[PDB]
Design a binder for this molecule. Structure first.
Ligand SMILES: Nc1nc2c(ncn2[C@@H]2O[C@H](COP(=O)(O)OP(=O)(O)OP(=O)(O)O)[C@@H](O)[C@H]2O)c(=O)[nH]1
Ligand SMILES: Nc1nc2c(ncn2[C@@H]2O[C@H](COP(=O)(O)OP(=O)(O)OP(=O)(O)O)[C@@H](O)[C@H]2O)c(=O)[nH]1
Ligand SMILES: Nc1nc2c(ncn2[C@@H]2O[C@H](COP(=O)(O)OP(=O)(O)O)[C@@H](O)[C@H]2O)c(=O)[nH]1
Ligand SMILES: [Mg+2]
Ligand SMILES: [Mg+2]
Ligand SMILES: [Zn+2]
Lengths: 80, 48, 275, 430, 177, 442, 41, 442
């Protein structure tokens, strides 16, 4: 698209969903396709728009697993 | 990027005003309203 | 054409060392192509002025230099070589080479006829037809000058000029007329981004005389038929195209140059009106 | 077993900067030259691309050549620029002007002795020398002329080593330079005689990689040069790390080139995938093989479906079984049997290396020898014939001094190369 | 440069020269910028008290000359027309304040995050004595304590840290700093 | 790295004033010749070097000469705002004008001044280490611009060698006119200029007036506007030497790509985002839109229509925030159009350049501020109509010997008229023949 | 050290504008002089 | 996805004001196109893109051109409330009108103005990626609307080719009339429109006056009411592109379904819940009631009675809270009616569309608020009666050459009158032939 680059895929509600309400997907009970159960009818080109993400990154990635005695004569003996 | 272009628009709106241009005295509308005729009265200093 | 660049030598160790290792002095002659286990390869560099003659002299010098020597190889700059062997083993003064190998022998032999066919085709085309000053030769003059109305606008609409929007001498405008959807042979379907393909915007003159009744008004002269100089141009009567806006026919000259299409249909014999 | 790199012209110097960034990252070399890596396995083969300097420092076995220092001054000013040895920068005082004859004959012969002196100083310092590696564009001026000059001189001086080139070639759709057909034809004529193995890349194919596979919104030349740096550093990976089935540049050449003129290859690199898609597919050897043969992932405009593979090679990086590699290469050869030349019983060589690039579980680089490359040369020869009949722009080249017979010889030799590919494509046992 | 690149598109050359003059004049530069903002606010307050709707052009250029701006031919009128919105001989305060303490998006967000970190009381305003001992060993630029009038508001904070922005040419380094 | 600018006559000096105003403001050199107070040896700051050299005290001075025969314009420079910027030796002035006579400039008056000019240029060229061409500004309509410009280019061409000479030239407009004798001076100038220039870029004041009326919202434009547009185009073309970019372009590359045959060196120039601040907020200004803009004849700075000819080569310069894929997509879209035609012997029609520095904004200016721009110079057979229209006016005047006694009196043989007119006839025939399709030539 | 550079060097993981150059000029770090090349920093 | 609107002359610009008022308020773009000072984007979603494009700063600008020969109406647009919405280049105005002469518009003046219009439309079409047609609003009764609309459609048809062109056309009412010369202009327009339009929808002001008297409660209607109704119709037809629905209908599907033979492309239009606020709360408004409503002649926006002809195809667009089973039951009941007849060669007479977005309410409007609406465009042989009456009035005037000297003076041959009259006679015979039963011809 050639519009503003700050746009993101919108959020849809689709209320009255049987699978989310501890109910079987019975015949003649597809309420989430009823237009009264939506919040908007505006079509948005989701196949071109990106998605929204919010998180605090990891700041670091690991790739390894984390893991005078000179002689000047004077020989002395110690049994340690 | 979006805020970049918004700030560019701010710059355009505030520093590039139309009356700022050097050639405003020629391109100004109402330029004949602000000027004077050749001679005004009979004691006009401009009429040498 | 080619010149020698190096000569290769295969030798045996000295006689005393060969006896010390335990290998028999005799029984070196055999009909097999294999070599003795103690034979070592060494190479030497020839100078710039070297030719075949002095290289062969150096090979003969190596032959007479020391015992334990029956193999030779002279390498040219083209990658080819020939070998020299003794006809009678352990006997000098019988050296004679019967061999010639190059890496491109069978390769060139097998690809011969196609190479000559393509060479006979292409080389006549490479001949210059223009003087170094950018001027045509005395033969095969063009039938008309370039800036003539029908030559310059043979397959392109002429511009339209108008005074609107200008204070001085007017200038024309660009158009959106696309070209034929033709692609090079054997190229992947490339899109750097979303392009406007020419499969759509197919002209409405395609099959107009068959599925429709053809032109039924004089308004074709407003945007489709042009009077260029002494002739007539029609945008509906050009090169034939298919249903997907692709050229159908390709034509060539005697020497094999692609010939562009023409929209010029007819000549208008204009005369000033007199009594 | 150490390689010496040469970077020539603007394209070559820019790709080289990204290559040496990737290599310095894989071996943990700080841009100051200090080793900061995290396993001994990195150090024990560092010699392959780096020479050892005395104190805490490493120096890269590379020669930089250009006719005007502008690119060199930009790369030297870059974040990794300090690593390069100052004495290794060779430059003139006026540009090539994108003209082959100028780049080859006037400033070329002026600089070439100092370039050869630097290359010899670097080569004779090695304890055992492997092949040279050269990056340049064929459409340019100093890249084409001085690159092919230097290649010819090194082939005279080092005929027993390997000569390998990475080369940028004109797109079929849009030109970057008006005079590309002359420079390309003369350079291909020089290369087919001099080179042992040459890889060709279209910028248009990299654009299609970026747009279709990675779906990047705003790609930059850094991304294209990163893709190239990835494949170049991948082909040599088995040279410099342990593995279950070692491979080498000479062994690759021996398995890939059936006849000495047929040495032009296509390249690809597999684990390319958009930031949105990675959640949808785990890495496995079938997935890598499928991407490996998809023409979407190939860096040339010619498509395999119009030709046949004589030979191909796949180098795998990662911890994996040999059974899946062998059986995948068998299954691909069996299922697509019409696209493989039938008088060779097995066209694919495989190789396996234990250590993948950081942050990927597995990777493969693909090298392919396919007859469909003949159509690209045919297109360039056509455009050359179109220009030559009209003597297009010819006075520049003739004014430098070239004989026209050079142009007719180079055109004839390239035309014979296309004919030779066409004959072997349609050959039969009979 | 700073007024030509895409990273900072709001900058203008002559206003950059004015800011350079008011910063490098003469008590360090950021202190001078905070003082300039304070004088502008008190002047506009006095004018509002008198019964006139804002600072005029003449006292604006007088203030600029007082802080030591070596102006040229026609630049004073350029700035006077630039910040006059209604075109009636008056200078808009909000536009001038927004331009005076201007910053890039990343730098502005860094300043906002830092300001949100500190605690406030009463009407959103900080005090020096409550927090001078807590952050004594970590504030390298000790001029902040001199900026306190032991009180400080967000506009002075933003002006102070916009003054120091010229010393750090990298945005990431500014954020971490 | 270095380039030397030569400014000749009235138009060339006034355009030079606008250019050096622009180059100062873009690099940051103050009018008194001083780097701003925040720049030191702390960071590497050398981009000016293409156009300025610094003295041992750190003052900057520019690599230019200003040439005039009348004092008034150079005395205006001497008394103007930039008095301290220029070295006084650089501003050279004679006593009296060439009175619209090419012959007076070339034979009588320019021969006296020319040796000082060559000595000054030599003194500049000795203080260089990578000079890579001359930029020349002159008008061919006036006497001193034609005569001294030709004489000076001839002398430079003898003294220097293998060095590029790029001209920006103001030609006589096809119906706007300033003097009666314009055809004679333009013919004789173009005759001398033909042998001794590598690429010539053509400008017409009537076209730039139309452009300032059409694109900008100026009812009563004057030469300062025109000169600011010219300064922007030259800054765009020379930006490739001075700032970082993806694809740089040296001045020698223009001649290699644009000139197919040694006489065929006249090119068209256009500039895309000529736009006012009020229009700028109604429109996005993407790469493809400005690329589409440079091909409209309404964008051109010379009054010729390229639809009456065929293109041989185009050179497209992009500066600012552009990505190579968009440049490739734009050029590929242009190539599809049917009303844009290239000669069949030129298949690879395009040269590209990509630079990161966006165009600078001048305080009094009328152009908007924009993040990206594209500039085009192109070679096309349509130029034959410009010469043909000048030649018809020459034939009309010479048929009656309308003014010849002036030219013969100031020192020129009458024969020179016939020689020049025959050379322009041959140039017309070159442009007729070159446009002939190869398939018809067999 | 920071979340802006804590990613491996793989294609598609580079964000060029996050590290914008403070300047766009060309230094003269590579000169010829009288024929003695200098690559001074 | 995107569509470009072309508004011509007085009716087309005035209807454009109502259309863009509605499309702004329905999508949510402010009348000036700006956004609140704290938001980063004015709206969350791209759905506007069919009719508006946003700049990178988020201002909205609409995909339209306004074409007129007199300044006054466009100057009213320039000074009105929507000043900031339109780009100033889009608002094109000439100096003087076409003076009710088709010849003056087509030959003399529109021929001068047409190239600017084509350049603006091209500039729009270059900023698109899935253009799927042109929408044109004009009246054929006046001089510039007829002449320049025809000339522009001819040029568009050559340049863009296969792309669809859908016209909304105001034809001369059968007894209300405004000018004497209406028949000549309407005949010559229809002659040009036959070759160069894919579907043409015809409107008559007398029908919309009748509709506003009976259904709405307006004693003194004016053109703004009619234009708001037209805007609602256009919004209903284009809603299928812009909002979610069960059965979408792309603009290319209309031409495929409605036109049996290439000349038979003139369609009738009607709209069901045209109702006042006081009536709306006295009645339920179910699907079957509005489906029954659309076939009554009291609902039509063109003054023709379809009971005097035969339908060839119908396209029914439902928007709002409708369920498919009720649409199917309604259409089967309509099919049962005896005063509705289809030609025996067209058994599958219907195309359906179903969209979920209910019609928008405009602050100053006169329509009630309703949950659902249906709009129909249909092809019927009854249309032949309108042409027969125009042709008879033309024949009456032309028998004495009553006004022809104006047309001949403005550039037209007298022969063009007779040619157009035989073509319209042949169109009448086509409508006679197409309507002949196949069972009767055996
Ligand atoms: N674009 C532009 N054109 C100019 C300018 N000054 C003069 N011209 C044009 O150039 C032509 C006049 O040439 P001049 O430069 O005055 O001639 P000259 O070089 O002074 O020659 P002499 O009169 O002999 O001194 C006319 O066509 C003018 O319109 C200018 O500043 N800008
Ligand atoms: N429905 C409707 N009809 C209109 C409107 N304006 C004018 N008309 C009708 O259209 C016809 C007049 O056409 P105009 O648009 O005035 O003609 P024009 O395009 O201005 O042509 P010129 O007079 O030559 O300038 C008459 O039948 C009017 O009743 C309008 O706003 N709405
Ligand atoms: N992939 C890639 N191509 C490049 C790069 N730089 C230049 N090119 C291409 O190489 C060609 C220009 O050749 P160039 O390097 O300028 O030749 P030179 O003047 O001899 O150095 C054009 O096709 C450019 O698109 C780069 O960094 N990456
Ligand atoms: Mg003068
Ligand atoms: Mg009117
Ligand atoms: Zn017509």
């Amino acid at each position: 698209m050639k519009n503003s680059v700050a746009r993101t895929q919108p959020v849809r509600k689709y209320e009255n969903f049987t699978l989310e309400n501890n109910l079987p997907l019975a015949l003649g009970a597809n309420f989430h396709d009823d237009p009264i159960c939506r919040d908007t009818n505006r079509t948005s080109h989701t196949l071109l728009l990106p998605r929204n993400v919010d998180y605090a990154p990891h700041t670091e990635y690991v790739f390894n697993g984390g893991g005078e005695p000179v002689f000047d004569g004077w020989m002395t003996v110690n049994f340690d | 990027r979006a805020n970049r272009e918004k700030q560019l628009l701010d710059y355009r709106e505030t520093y590039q005003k139309k009356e700022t241009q050097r050639e405003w005295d020629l391109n100004d509308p109402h330029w004949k309203a602000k000027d004077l005729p050749g001679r005004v009265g009979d004691n006009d200093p401009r009429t040498g | 054409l080619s010149q020698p660049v190096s000569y290769s030598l295969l030798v045996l160790p000295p006689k005393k060392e060969l006896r010390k290792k335990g290998y028999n002095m005799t029984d070196i002659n055999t009909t097999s192509t294999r070599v003795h286990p103690l034979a070592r390869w060494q190479t030497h560099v020839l100078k710039h002025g070297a030719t075949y003659r002095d290289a062969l002299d150096a090979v003969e010098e190596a032959n007479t230099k020391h015992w334990g020597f029956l193999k030779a190889r002279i390498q040219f700059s083209c990658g080819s070589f020939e070998s020299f062997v003794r006809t009678n083993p352990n006997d000098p003064s019988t050296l004679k080479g019967v061999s010639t190998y190059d890496p491109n022998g069978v390769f060139h032999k097998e690809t011969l006829d196609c190479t000559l066919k393509n060479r006979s085709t292409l080389l006549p085309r490479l001949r210059a037809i223009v003087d170094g000053r950018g001027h045509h030769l005395s033969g095969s003059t063009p039938p008309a000058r370039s800036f003539h109305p029908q030559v310059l606008y043979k397959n392109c609409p002429p511009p339209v000029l108008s005074q609107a929007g200008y204070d001085f001498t007017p200038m024309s405008h660009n158009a959106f007329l696309l070209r034929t959807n033709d692609h090079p042979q054997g190229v992947r379907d490339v899109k750097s981004d979303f392009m406007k393909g020419s499969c759509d915007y197919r002209p409405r003159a395609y099959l107009r005389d068959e599925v429709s009744g053809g032109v039924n008004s004089r308004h074709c002269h407003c945007a489709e038929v042009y009077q260029v100089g002494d002739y007539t141009m029609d945008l509906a009567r050009g090169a034939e195209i298919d249903h997907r806006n692709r050229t159908v026919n390709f034509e060539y000259t005697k020497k094999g140059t692609l010939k562009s299409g023409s929209n010029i249909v007819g000549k208008r014999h204009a005369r000033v009106p007199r009594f | 077993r150490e390689i010496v790199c040469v970077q020539a012209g603007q394209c070559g110097n820019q790709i080289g900067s990204k290559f040496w960034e990737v290599i310095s990252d894989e071996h943990g070399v700080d841009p100051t030259g200090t080793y900061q890596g995290d396993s001994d396995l990195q150090l024990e083969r560092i010699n392959v691309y780096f020479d050892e300097a005395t104190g805490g420092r490493y120096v890269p076995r590379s020669v930089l050549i250009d006719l005007e220092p502008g690119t060199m001054d930009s790369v030297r000013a870059g974040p990794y620029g300090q690593i390069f040895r100052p004495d290794n920068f060779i430059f003139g005082q006026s540009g090539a002007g994108n003209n082959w004859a100028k780049g080859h004959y006037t400033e070329g012969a002026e600089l070439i002795d100092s370039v050869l002196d630097v290359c010899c100083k670097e080569a004779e310092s090695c304890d055992c020398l492997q092949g040279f590696q050269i990056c340049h564009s064929l459409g340019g001026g100093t890249g084409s002329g001085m690159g092919t000059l230097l290649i010819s001189k090194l082939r005279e001086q080092y005929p027993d080593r390997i000569m390998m080139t990475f080369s940028i070639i004109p797109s079929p759709k849009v030109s970057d330079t008006v005079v590309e057909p002359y420079n390309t034809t003369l350079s291909v004529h020089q290369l087919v005689e001099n080179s042992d193995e040459s890889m060709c890349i279209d910028n248009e194919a990299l654009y299609d990689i970026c747009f279709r596979t990675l779906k990047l919104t705003t790609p930059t030349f850094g991304d294209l040069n990163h893709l190239v740096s990835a494949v170049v550093s991948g082909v040599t990976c088995c040279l410099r790390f342990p593995g279950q089935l070692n491979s080498d540049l000479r062994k690759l050449a021996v398995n890939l080139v059936p006849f000495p003129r047929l040495h032009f290859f296509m390249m690809g690199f597999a684990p390319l995938t958009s930031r949105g898609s990675q959640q949808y597919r785990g890495l496995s050897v079938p997935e890598l093989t499928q991407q490996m043969f998809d023409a979407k992932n190939m860096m040339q405009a010619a498509d395999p479906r119009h030709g046949r593979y004589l030979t191909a090679s796949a180098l795998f990086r990662g911890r994996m079984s040999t059974k899946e590699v062998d059986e995948q290469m068998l299954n691909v050869q069996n299922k697509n049997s019409s696209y493989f030349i039938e008088w060779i019983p097995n066209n694919i060589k495989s190789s396996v290396c234990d250590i993948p690039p950081k942050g990927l579980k597995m990777a493969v680089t693909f090298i392919g020898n396919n007859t469909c490359i003949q159509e690209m040369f045919r297109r360039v020869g056509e455009q050359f014939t179109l220009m030559f009949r009209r003597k297009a722009f010819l006075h520049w080249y003739t004014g430098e001094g070239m004989d026209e017979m050079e142009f007719t010889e180079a055109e004839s030799n390239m035309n014979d190369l296309v004919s030779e590919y066409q004959q072997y494509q349609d050959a039969t046992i009979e | 440069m700073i007024y030509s690149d895409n990273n900072n598109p709001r900058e203008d050359s002559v206003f950059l020269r004015v800011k350079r003059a008011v910063r490098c004049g003469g008590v360090t530069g950021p202190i001078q910028m905070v003082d300039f903002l304070r004088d502008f606010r008190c002047l506009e307050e006095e004018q509002r008290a008198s019964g006139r709707k804002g600072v005029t052009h003449k006292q604006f250029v007088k203030l600029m000359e007082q802080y030591g701006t070596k102006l040229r031919e026609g630049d004073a009128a350029y700035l006077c027309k630039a910040f006059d919105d209604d075109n009636d001989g008056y200078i808009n305060p909000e536009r001038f304040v927004r331009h005076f303490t201007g910053l890039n998006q990343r730098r502005h967000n860094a300043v906002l995050r830092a300001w949100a970190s500190l605690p406030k009381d009463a009407k959103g305003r900080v005090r020096r004595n409550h927090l001078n001992e807590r952050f004594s060993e970590t504030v390298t630029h000790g001029d902040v304590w001199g900026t306190f009038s032991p009180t400080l508001c967000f506009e002075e904070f933003l002006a102070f840290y916009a003054a120091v922005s010229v010393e750090i040419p990298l945005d990431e380094k500014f954020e971490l700093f | 790295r270095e380039a030397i600018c030569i400014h000749i006559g009235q138009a060339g000096c006034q355009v030079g004033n606008a250019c050096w105003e622009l180059f100062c403001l873009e690099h940051g050199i103050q009018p008194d010749g001083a780097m701003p107070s925040d720049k030191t040896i702390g960071v590497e700051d050398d981009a000016f070097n293409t156009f300025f050299s610094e003295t041992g005290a750190g003052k900057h001075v520019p690599r230019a000469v200003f040439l005039d025969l009348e004092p008034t314009v150079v005395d205006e420079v001497r008394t103007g705002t930039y008095r301290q910027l220029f070295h006084p030796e650089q501003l050279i002035s004679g006593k009296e004008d060439a009175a619209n006579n090419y012959a007076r400039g070339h034979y009588t008056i320019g021969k006296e001044i020319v040796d000082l000019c060559l000595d000054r240029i030599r003194k500049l060229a000795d203080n260089c280490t990578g000079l890579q061409g001359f930029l020349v500004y002159h008008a061919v309509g006036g006497g001193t611009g034609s005569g001294l410009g030709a004489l000076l280019l001839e002398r430079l061409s003898v003294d220097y060698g293998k060095k590029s000479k790029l001209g920006y030239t103001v030609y006589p407009s096809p119906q706007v006119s300033t003097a009666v004798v314009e055809p004679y001076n333009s013919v004789l100038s173009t005759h001398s200029l033909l042998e001794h220039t590598d690429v010539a870029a053509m400008l017409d004041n009537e076209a730039i007036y139309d452009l300032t009326r059409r694109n900008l919202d100026i009812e009563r434009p004057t030469y300062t506007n025109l000169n600011r547009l010219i300064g922007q185009v030259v800054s765009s073309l020379t930006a490739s030497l001075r700032f970082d970019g993806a694809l740089n372009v040296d001045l020698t590359e223009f001649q290699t790509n644009l000139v197919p045959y040694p006489r065929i060196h006249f090119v068209l120039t256009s500039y895309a985002p000529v736009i006012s601040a009020e229009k700028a907020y109604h429109e996005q200004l993407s790469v493809s839109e400005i690329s589409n803009a440079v091909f409209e004849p309404a964008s051109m700075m010379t009054k010729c229509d390229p639809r009456h000819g065929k293109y041989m080569a185009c050179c497209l310069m992009y500066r600012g925030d552009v990505v190579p894929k968009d440049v490739n997509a734009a050029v590929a879209t242009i190539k599809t159009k049917r009303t844009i035609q290239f000669v069949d012997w030129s298949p690879t029609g395009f040269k590209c350049g990509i630079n990161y520095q966006p165009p600078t904004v001048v305080p009094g200016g009328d152009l908007a501020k924009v993040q990206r721009a594209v500039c085009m110079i192109a070679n096309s057979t349509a130029i034959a109509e410009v010469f043909a229209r000048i030649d018809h006016k020459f034939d009309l005047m010479y048929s009656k010997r309308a003014f010849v006694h002036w030219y013969v009196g100031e020192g020129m043989e009458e024969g020179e008229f016939s020689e020049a007119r025959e050379d322009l006839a041959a140039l017309e025939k070159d442009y007729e023949e070159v446009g002939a399709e190869s398939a018809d030539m067999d | 050290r920071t979340i802006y550079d804590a990613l491996p060097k793989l294609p598609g993981f580079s964000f060029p504008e996050l590290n914008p150059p403070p300047t766009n000029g060309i230094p003269q770090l590579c000169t010829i002089r009288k024929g003695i090349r200098t690559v001074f920093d």
